[PDB]
Design a protein around this ligand. Structure first.
Ligand SMILES: CC(C)(COP(=O)(O)OP(=O)(O)OC[C@H]1O[C@@H](n2cnc3c(N)ncnc32)[C@H](O)[C@@H]1OP(=O)(O)O)[C@@H](O)C(=O)NCCC(=O)NCCSCC(=O)O
Ligand SMILES: CC(C)(COP(=O)(O)OP(=O)(O)OC[C@H]1O[C@@H](n2cnc3c(N)ncnc32)[C@H](O)[C@@H]1OP(=O)(O)O)[C@@H](O)C(=O)NCCC(=O)NCCSCC(=O)O
Ligand SMILES: O=C([O-])CC(=O)C(=O)O
Ligand SMILES: O=C([O-])CC(=O)C(=O)O
Lengths: 381, 380
């Protein structure tokens, strides 16, 4: 015992029943169901949400019961809203979500880990996350506060409150795909952070807060904004080559939206996000200009990095989808919409850890510092 | 290969900061044993400096350092309000989370940088003092107050928290508690924070993640859960019955006992015990809490000492905080742990990002349902 597991690569932190990843062939499954199959069938997010908490897809009766438990989360305390609204407007959207969930971790003095109550607490929090995100977006956009109302879909309920208008069928559907696509991804940095916290037997909301803290970072969920920021920065499609050689190839910066710890091939979610990014952006000429820079850079990226197994990830196109829906490129909002979705995966993983395989997470470090030495009083230093 | 349960003996990084011999019960900060530091009467700020800069400060450097820490004694009103707008019966550590979370939001200009990192951390150490003062005050239903510059960081914290002049005994006791909780290599909290910062997320979010993990009863939460056990007992005569009914029969874990690394007496516990004795003996109601604690200790060692499970740092610290004058409620004692630990947290995050940066992303073993086609809703 003296070897460093750099980045914890290939170290198994738990067993899971929820998500499997084929990094070589680019296969992502939720509870056995492939992410392509789920979208092809045009499934609602609530069904996938239910799948992660319970283990199988819901019957008509169970789905209707599940939605009412989620919609309970649409009503949140004033201090929770205020936790967002009393922060500087120019703040990070994910950190705003962090601040709001932290308020819940504090106020929820009666939370206890229990197999009877876990899934209900989780289901309501998924609703609370929606209510939180609406108000995060509204506060940033200088708008008055609003809560999501119950409707035909979770995606619609969210979109309606966020913009303060009726969302179109096409808008609702694209958000519904994004929510499914970002639901879970086994044990990334965010989920890991949350699992470490919950391993001490701290509460669910603390786990979500620790997860959000990690997700905020540029190498993780922060790429959801940082990738599209690259597209916004190039402006002219003919400038793409120059920008790529100037920023990435000279070794200055990493290519945002590219690369993965697991996938050595094209990201499955990146396929789906691209097709939808192509469809919706082609309806808005100024957004399509972003997409046509994106695909051009994608080609230079694939050629330059493909041999090293660096391929587009789920964050490369996702931001274009959100921009097409109506959300602006500012304040890390795209990462916050990522987080809005990933809360389901995060929570399902914490429950699976505590109920069935609980143990404190506490690694070691190899000491490489100063040898044993006598303390010297400050006077003679 | 398969599951590294709890990540035991898996190395996550290298460090120059802290050494632990779990078998002998040895703890060193930058090569200085914890016993050397305490015996010397070292100021907490000296040990703060040691963690941020890699060596002990000169008198000139300590003056410069204190100036930077004190900057954090002024914090924005929304950070104070991030605390005060929450229900008073809220967990104290979770209240610290909310405050630091607000900083993570507002601090939009934070960059991981060789030239700025240490000053940011020094200022945050001060800020953690401001936060904890206000966390304690709000819980007790008192007006907001900030720490003021003085001779020592501990004095500045205690004075502001209580609103009175702290006695020399109280100041030394707090100073020692601050040193003893400064760092402990890569425990759950620090790890949770390192996972966060490996995404190149900000220092404050790193602290926030660490705070979320420190709350738990298996970790820093034991700073209150241990002393809670002594409060339940009330009568030294009923120690044996409580230990027989709850631990040996009920299977509940004895809080303030055991450790991931130490398989012997925790060096910090040993020091905390001596102070708990010195401080409690003078005030009758706290003294008998100590008397319950030491009587439960003997049953603990007789039962678990052969299994490598001995008193840890949280077992006696609660009594030490109680003697200083902090009440046994709202996980205040875990919040005081945090106030200290923020120095160790930040030192590790800087160390990891500057000199050994890589994304922390482990794997899981799949035992779930095999590949299956998306079933129609009614079959099912
Ligand atoms: C996600 C990653 C951190 C994973 O990398 P990792 O598995 O930790 O390996 P690593 O960081 O040690 O990199 C290995 C090598 O590949 C190189 N590399 C990896 N990704 C990239 C990239 N996007 N652009 C340029 N070079 C890269 C890196 O420079 C290193 O080179 P060398 O061996 O010469 O030092 C990285 O691919 C990256 O930074 N990607 C860009 C940001 C991004 O899109 N992140 C989102 C990931 S997906 C979902 C999400 O989390 O939201
Ligand atoms: C700190 C610990 C989590 C470390 O344990 P670990 O290295 O994760 O080992 P583990 O949890 O897999 O347990 C191994 C065995 O020892 C037993 N064990 C460990 N600690 C205790 C205890 N305090 N009382 C009774 N049994 C114990 C445990 O029951 C298990 O036995 P079995 O296999 O028969 O169930 C544990 O000692 C514990 O739960 N302590 C009690 C709470 C506490 O005092 N925590 C604070 C630790 S120090 C400071 C701090 O973090 O702040
Ligand atoms: O799997 C990872 O390492 C990160 C990722 O793509 C996600 O969490 O969506
Ligand atoms: O080292 C550990 O696992 C926990 C501990 O004693 C601390 O963080 O003070």
């Amino acid at each position: 015992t003296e070897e460093i597991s750099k980045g914890l690569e290939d170290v198994n932190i738990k067993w899971t029943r929820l998500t499997t990843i084929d990094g070589n062939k680019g296969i992502l499954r939720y509870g056995g169901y492939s992410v392509e199959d789920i979208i092809a069938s045009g499934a609602q997010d609530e069904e996938i949400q239910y799948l992660f908490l319970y283990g199988n897809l819901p019957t008509e009766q169970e789905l209707r019961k599940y939605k009412e438990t989620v919609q309970k989360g649409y009503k949140i305390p004033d201090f929770v809203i205020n936790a967002i609204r009393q922060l500087p407007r120019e703040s990070d959207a994910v950190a705003m979500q962090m601040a709001a969930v932290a308020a819940m971790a504090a106020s929820e003095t009666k939370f206890k880990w229990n197999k009877d109550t876990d899934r209900d607490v989780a289901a309501e929090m998924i609703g609370r996350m929606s209510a939180i995100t609406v108000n995060v977006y509204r506060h940033i956009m200088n708008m008055p506060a609003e809560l999501p109302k119950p409707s035909d879909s979770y995606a619609e309920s969210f979109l309606n409150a966020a913009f303060g208008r009726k969302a179109t069928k096409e808008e609702i559907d694209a958000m519904n795909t994004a929510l499914i696509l970002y639901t879970d991804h086994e044990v990334p940095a965010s989920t890991t952070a949350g699992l470490v916290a919950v391993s001490t037997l701290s509460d669910m909301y603390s786990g979500i807060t620790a997860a959000l803290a990690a997700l905020k970072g540029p190498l993780h969920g922060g790429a959801a904004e940082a990738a599209i920021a690259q597209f916004d920065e190039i402006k002219d499609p003919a400038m793409v080559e120059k920008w790529f050689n100037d920023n990435i190839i000279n070794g200055k910066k990493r290519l945002m939206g590219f690369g993965h710890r697991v996938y050595k091939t094209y990201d499955p979610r990146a396929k789906i996000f691209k097709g939808i990014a192509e469809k919706l952006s082609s309806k808005k000429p100024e957004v399509h200009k972003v997409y046509e820079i994106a695909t051009k850079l994608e080609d230079f990226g694939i050629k330059a990095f493909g041999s090293k197994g660096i391929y587009p990830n789920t964050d490369y196109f996702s931001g274009i989808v959100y921009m097409s829906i109506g959300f602006p490129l500012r304040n890390n909002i795209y990462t916050a919409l990522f987080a809005l979705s990933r809360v389901t995966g995060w929570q399902a993983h914490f429950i699976e850890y505590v109920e069935e395989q609980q143990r404190l997470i506490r690694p070691r470090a190899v000491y490489v510092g100063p040898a044993e030495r006598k303390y010297v009083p400050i006077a003679e230093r």
